[PDB]
Amino acid sequence: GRVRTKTVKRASKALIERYYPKLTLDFQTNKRLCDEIATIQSKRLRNKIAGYTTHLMKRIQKGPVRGISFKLQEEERERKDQYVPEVSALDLSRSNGVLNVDNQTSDLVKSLGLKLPLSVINVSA
Amino acid sequence: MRAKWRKKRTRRLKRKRRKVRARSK
Amino acid sequence: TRSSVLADALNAINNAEKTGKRQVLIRPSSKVIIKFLQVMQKHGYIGEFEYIDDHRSGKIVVQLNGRLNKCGVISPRFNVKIGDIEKWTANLLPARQFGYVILTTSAGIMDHEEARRKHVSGKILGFVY
Amino acid sequence: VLVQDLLHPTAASEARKHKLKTLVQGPRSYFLDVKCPGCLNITTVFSHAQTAVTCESCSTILCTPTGGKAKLSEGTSFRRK
Amino acid sequence: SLPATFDLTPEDAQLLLAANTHLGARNVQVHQEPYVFNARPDGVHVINVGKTWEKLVLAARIIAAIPNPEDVVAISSRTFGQRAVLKFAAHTGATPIAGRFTPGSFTNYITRSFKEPRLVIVTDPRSDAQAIKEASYVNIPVIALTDLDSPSEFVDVAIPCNNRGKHSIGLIWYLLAREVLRLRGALVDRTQPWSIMPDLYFYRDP
Amino acid sequence: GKGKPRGLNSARKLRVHRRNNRWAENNYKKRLLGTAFKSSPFGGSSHAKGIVLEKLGIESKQPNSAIRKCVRVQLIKNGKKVTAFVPNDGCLNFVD
Amino acid sequence: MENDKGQLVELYVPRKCSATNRIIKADDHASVQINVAKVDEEGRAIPGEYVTYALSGYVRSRGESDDSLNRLAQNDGLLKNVWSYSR
Amino acid sequence: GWVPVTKLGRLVKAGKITTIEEIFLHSLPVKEFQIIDTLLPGLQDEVMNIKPVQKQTRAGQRTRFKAVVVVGDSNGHVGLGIKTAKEVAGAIRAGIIIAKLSVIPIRRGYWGTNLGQPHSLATKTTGKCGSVTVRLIPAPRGSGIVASPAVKKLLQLAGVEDVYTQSNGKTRTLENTLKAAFVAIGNTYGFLTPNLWAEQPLPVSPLDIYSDEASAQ
Amino acid sequence: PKKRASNGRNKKGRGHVKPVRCVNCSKSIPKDKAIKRMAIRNIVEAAAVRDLSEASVYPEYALPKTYNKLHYCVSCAIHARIVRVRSREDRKNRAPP
RNA sequence: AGGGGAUCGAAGAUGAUCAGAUACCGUCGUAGUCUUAACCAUAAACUAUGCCGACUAGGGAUCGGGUGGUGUUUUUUUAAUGACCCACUCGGCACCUUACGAGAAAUCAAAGUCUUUGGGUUCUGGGGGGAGUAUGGUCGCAAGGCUGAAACUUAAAGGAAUUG
Numbered sequence A: 001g002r003v004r005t006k007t008v009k010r011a012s013k014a015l016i017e018r019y020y021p022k023l024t025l026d027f028q029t030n031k032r033l034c035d036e037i038a039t040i041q042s043k044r045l046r047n048k049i050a051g052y053t054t055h056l057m058k059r060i061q062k063g064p065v066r067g068i069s070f071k072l073q074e075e076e077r078e079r080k081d082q083y084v085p086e087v088s089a090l091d092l093s094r095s096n097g098v099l100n101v102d103n104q105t106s107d108l109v110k111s112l113g114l115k116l117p118l119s120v121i122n123v124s125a
Numbered sequence B: 001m002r003a004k005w006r007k008k009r010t011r012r013l014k015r016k017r018r019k020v021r022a023r024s025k
Numbered sequence C: 001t002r003s004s005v006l007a008d009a010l011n012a013i014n015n016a017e018k019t020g021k022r023q024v025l026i027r028p029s030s031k032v033i034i035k036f037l038q039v040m041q042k043h044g045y046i047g048e049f050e051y052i053d054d055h056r057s058g059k060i061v062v063q064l065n066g067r068l069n070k071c072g073v074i075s076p077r078f079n080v081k082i083g084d085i086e087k088w089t090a091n092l093l094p095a096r097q098f099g100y101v102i103l104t105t106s107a108g109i110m111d112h113e114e115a116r117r118k119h120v121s122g123k124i125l126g127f128v129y
Numbered sequence D: 001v002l003v004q005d006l007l008h009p010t011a012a013s014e015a016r017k018h019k020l021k022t023l024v025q026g027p028r029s030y031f032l033d034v035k036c037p038g039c040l041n042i043t044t045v046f047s048h049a050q051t052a053v054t055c056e057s058c059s060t061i062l063c064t065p066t067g068g069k070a071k072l073s074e075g076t077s078f079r080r081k
Numbered sequence E: 001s002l003p004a005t006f007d008l009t010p011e012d013a014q015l016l017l018a019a020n021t022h023l024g025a026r027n028v029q030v031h032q033e034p035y036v037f038n039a040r041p042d043g044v045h046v047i048n049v050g051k052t053w054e055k056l057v058l059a060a061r062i063i064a065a066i067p068n069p070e071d072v073v074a075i076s077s078r079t080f081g082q083r084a085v086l087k088f089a090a091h092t093g094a095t096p097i098a099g100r101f102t103p104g105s106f107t108n109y110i111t112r113s114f115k116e117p118r119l120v121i122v123t124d125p126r127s128d129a130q131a132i133k134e135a136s137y138v139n140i141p142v143i144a145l146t147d148l149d150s151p152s153e154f155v156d157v158a159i160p161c162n163n164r165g166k167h168s169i170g171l172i173w174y175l176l177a178r179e180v181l182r183l184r185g186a187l188v189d190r191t192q193p194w195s196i197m198p199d200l201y202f203y204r205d206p
Numbered sequence F: 001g002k003g004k005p006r007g008l009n010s011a012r013k014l015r016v017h018r019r020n021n022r023w024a025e026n027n028y029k030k031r032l033l034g035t036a037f038k039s040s041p042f043g044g045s046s047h048a049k050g051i052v053l054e055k056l057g058i059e060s061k062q063p064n065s066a067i068r069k070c071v072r073v074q075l076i077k078n079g080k081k082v083t084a085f086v087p088n089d090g091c092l093n094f095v096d
Numbered sequence G: 001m002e003n004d005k006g007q008l009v010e011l012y013v014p015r016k017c018s019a020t021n022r023i024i025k026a027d028d029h030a031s032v033q034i035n036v037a038k039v040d041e042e043g044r045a046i047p048g049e050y051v052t053y054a055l056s057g058y059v060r061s062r063g064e065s066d067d068s069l070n071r072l073a074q075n076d077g078l079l080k081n082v083w084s085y086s087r
Numbered sequence H: 001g002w003v004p005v006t007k008l009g010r011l012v013k014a015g016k017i018t019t020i021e022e023i024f025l026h027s028l029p030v031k032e033f034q035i036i037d038t039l040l041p042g043l044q045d046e047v048m049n050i051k052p053v054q055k056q057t058r059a060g061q062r063t064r065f066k067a068v069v070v071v072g073d074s075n076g077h078v079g080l081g082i083k084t085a086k087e088v089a090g091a092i093r094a095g096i097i098i099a100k101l102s103v104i105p106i107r108r109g110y111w112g113t114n115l116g117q118p119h120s121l122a123t124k125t126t127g128k129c130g131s132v133t134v135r136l137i138p139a140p141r142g143s144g145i146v147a148s149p150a151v152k153k154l155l156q157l158a159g160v161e162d163v164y165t166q167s168n169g170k171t172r173t174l175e176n177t178l179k180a181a182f183v184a185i186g187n188t189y190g191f192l193t194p195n196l197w198a199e200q201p202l203p204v205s206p207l208d209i210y211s212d213e214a215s216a217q
Numbered sequence I: 001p002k003k004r005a006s007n008g009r010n011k012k013g014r015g016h017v018k019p020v021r022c023v024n025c026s027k028s029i030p031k032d033k034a035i036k037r038m039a040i041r042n043i044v045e046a047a048a049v050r051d052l053s054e055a056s057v058y059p060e061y062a063l064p065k066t067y068n069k070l071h072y073c074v075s076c077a078i079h080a081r082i083v084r085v086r087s088r089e090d091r092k093n094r095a096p097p
Numbered sequence J: 001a002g003g004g005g006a007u008c009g010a011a012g013a014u015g016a017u018c019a020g021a022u023a024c025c026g027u028c029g030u031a032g033u034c035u036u037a038a039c040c041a042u043a044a045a046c047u048a049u050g051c052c053g054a055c056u057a058g059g060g061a062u063c064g065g066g067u068g069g070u071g072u073u074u075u076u077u078u079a080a081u082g083a084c085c086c087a088c089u090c091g092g093c094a095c096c097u098u099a100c101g102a103g104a105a106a107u108c109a110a111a112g113u114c115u116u117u118g119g120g121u122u123c124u125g126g127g128g129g130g131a132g133u134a135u136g137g138u139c140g141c142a143a144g145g146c147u148g149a150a151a152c153u154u155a156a157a158g159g160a161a162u163u164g
């Protein structure tokens, strides 16, 4: 029955996102870290927050944790988010410049008359 | 008390009386 | 069965206007309906209406400009005296400065305003505002 | 659509509707100039016939009534109107 | 009216059909019928991409009419529109709402996420129905990336596209971003295509 | 058509129907049936003299728990026996 | 509305819907007013002058605003061949 | 003092919008009552009724007080507000704020000819709340407000002086009678009249033109 | 007040269907109103099945099965926990699971 | 009033239960349950929603009829037909989403197109009891049906929904 109060959880949620690069996965270091970086009121609460914070380090270590995003996680996501596939991005080259469609889209191209390479495949049903 | 038990009670009462009014008719 | 084609034509227009339609189709569109449309169009409540000649009874497609509030019929066509026009107008119209009570009188279908200056009276057909 | 030209419906839209519900109601039925397999005599047969129409030479059958359109007797040429 | 350059260029229609944006939905409602070019066998309908392009160009002119780019909110809730909206928000002001809308972001003038846009753009009226309904209390226009089966209530401008394809959704947002930048001194070089590849608006995994 | 007829020649159906349903009015029924003149202590009169027959103290209805101190009076015009209140603090002594 | 010596006496004249000529009232919080940018040559938004449509909340709620904008833009030339009168 | 959190408030506080009818013209939603006070200063206030609303709980009956407050001067502006608070005084304060948010403009017309200033309603209108239906008829000059004392005062805080009235349903319900009348008076700009048939150039919104000063950094 | 659009049954176009007898108390309930469950149970068991397979001649023997349609009155279905009275808006849910 | 009468089963019998149990529960069981020839004419006879007509919003499914696909399907390696699929349409039983709109609300595609009140028409109601009672009439073999008050009494009865 050791469920941790949101004041403990939101305190970790107020610590990791700003000090992840300098924290450690060791609780003993963390509570000594919690001494000066965090201005807490009681020693019992000091150890409780350090324990949850250390547990968050393990959870963070094995993949990102939802709801908490440290600073270096932001750049880690954005570099992955700047992906621009240099080919295959609907730039033709599927059949080396002759896109494929059905009869109706083909006539559609003719309803607009635009000059575009094309093809036609049978359907049914 | 349903009105059908009122209905059934009143039917008996309405029909013991056309028998007692018959002894004078 | 139908009893008042003018009532059905006026009701069809009214439902169309409340739905924002800019036109409505009317069947069977008698010539009392046409005369009633003509007075409404003369005062600007509707636009151009066109009579489709089927060989049976007629159709009308009325263009609505959105200026119509409530076109309605008064049934039965009560015999209204020339002095009893004011009573109908007060009961049927929203204000004295606008709206019309269309009367079928011996001089033809006409609004209560024109029928007052021709000094004729008949039976009340319907209203428009 | 709240705005449409009820006086000029598209021909595909009117062909979709019931015959009594077009802009001006009319029949979708037609007449056939059926030809007897043997003789050259031309008989004018209603599409929705509903009677077993008979030619002169082919005095057995020329069409067969059904629920709607009449069924031609699988050996007869025809042209509309 | 509109000058001749704004017509559907073949290069733009090259990829507009490639992303299968023409692939409409099996079910079409009476408010999306005009965009139904035809019905293919197997029941998939086809959209007239000329309607898609012309409606897209209209929305850009509507978009590039608010004096401020910071109050043109682009809404997405589906996971496919998340990257499309955010990178739509990068090129213009276009404050984005990706993920959850937080009901009461247009009313409830005291919250942190309370905003007062002059225009809301939704990637999907069905999924962003909360955003659309929230926008109908405050007299805000709505531009929707509707499909043939999507609702049209409180949708002032509708761009017909394929809501079931990540390629289509990313392309529509990309094109919308390009036209609004063209309708300002940002990409004044109208003739040549945009330098950035449209793929960066597409969905991202994992 | 919402119930009632409308036609110009329907005034008989309208008037007869109204005359039939008017009897549902308790105040109109009583005047037309003339129950007050026929069956009532006062023959449709605002006042009536009488002869005091006895003095009664009646228990008021609940919840009041009081005594009302009325008098039983024999009417002079028709002879009907009624009971009548004596409204004041006392004044029963006056009646005798 | 006027009075005897002219001199219009009316708080304001409400804007009418561009699709139905309906009065847009003060508490019509679903009624929008769309502004479409004017465009000169080479497509410049030239901010300041717009083509403006007012859509009543009734049309938006009933879901015919998207078609109403199509018809009104087609009428003013904003769109070219999207809206067809006959359907 | 007052710090504007809304674009409308920022314009009104800065002075870019100097009259309320500009808000009504574009149907801008007012959220800060400071906007109404800045544009309608002399807005006299009255309370029509205070009634207790009770909720049954495990221990006893919880009581709260519901206040109906009417704002509006005698120059064609009216508001109405329904607020329930734990105490009467608080219900009045929040009742006044709610009524100021719901300020709407009304229409004054002539029963007869267009002589003098408008005195009556421009058109007979009607509002419904609950089962109560309130109908307002334009009246000749000098007829006064022929209405129940509650609806009569709501019409005095409207600027109307001549109007007839009819009613339906449980008019003894004051909140529904006030809401029904309040709906009725607001419909007076809802109705379309021949004088308003003329087209207008549909002017731009204040939130569009003065969008530089509004929504600061 | 009307608790259900389909009053308590499935009858729109009949005026009278027929009665059927509840399998638990023999009450007469109309066939449309009756709660119906189909019992599709193996002939022997899911526990004794192994025992009867070892002791069976014909080393491969298709195990037969029992079928019977069960009709319950409203009371018996509730008492036996077949229906489980639901909320005002959940009772509109007509899905089998 | 004949026939027939297996089962179930007002009445009745009886066994338990219960303080009592002329009830629920168990076992019998007459009338009835079935049929023929005649009666009665009532049901929560219900969708508690008269009938005819017009209009107003989106969808899918289904029953019956019809129309069209160079559609699938068969025994003669295809034909017609049947069955099936798709797209329409007419009529019907309904259903789903929404609130134009209505309503007191529950809810309603009608219970909408109603103080902006009029398509045509029939029936019924006027606070709760007394009371569908008394009497009269009429129908019926009877049961009872239809018609149907008054004296008197009464500040409420009631509908929908909310918290407990």
Ligand SMILES: [Mg+2]
Residues within 6 Å of the ligand: none
């Ligand atoms: Mg109950």
Ligand SMILES: [Mg+2]
Residues within 6 Å of the ligand: I015, I016
């Ligand atoms: Mg039945």
Ligand SMILES: [Mg+2]
Residues within 6 Å of the ligand: J048
């Ligand atoms: Mg009944």
Ligand SMILES: [Mg+2]
Residues within 6 Å of the ligand: J092, J093
């Ligand atoms: Mg059926």
Ligand SMILES: [Mg+2]
Residues within 6 Å of the ligand: F024, F025, F026, J126
């Ligand atoms: Mg009464």
Ligand SMILES: [Mg+2]
Residues within 6 Å of the ligand: none
């Ligand atoms: Mg009574």
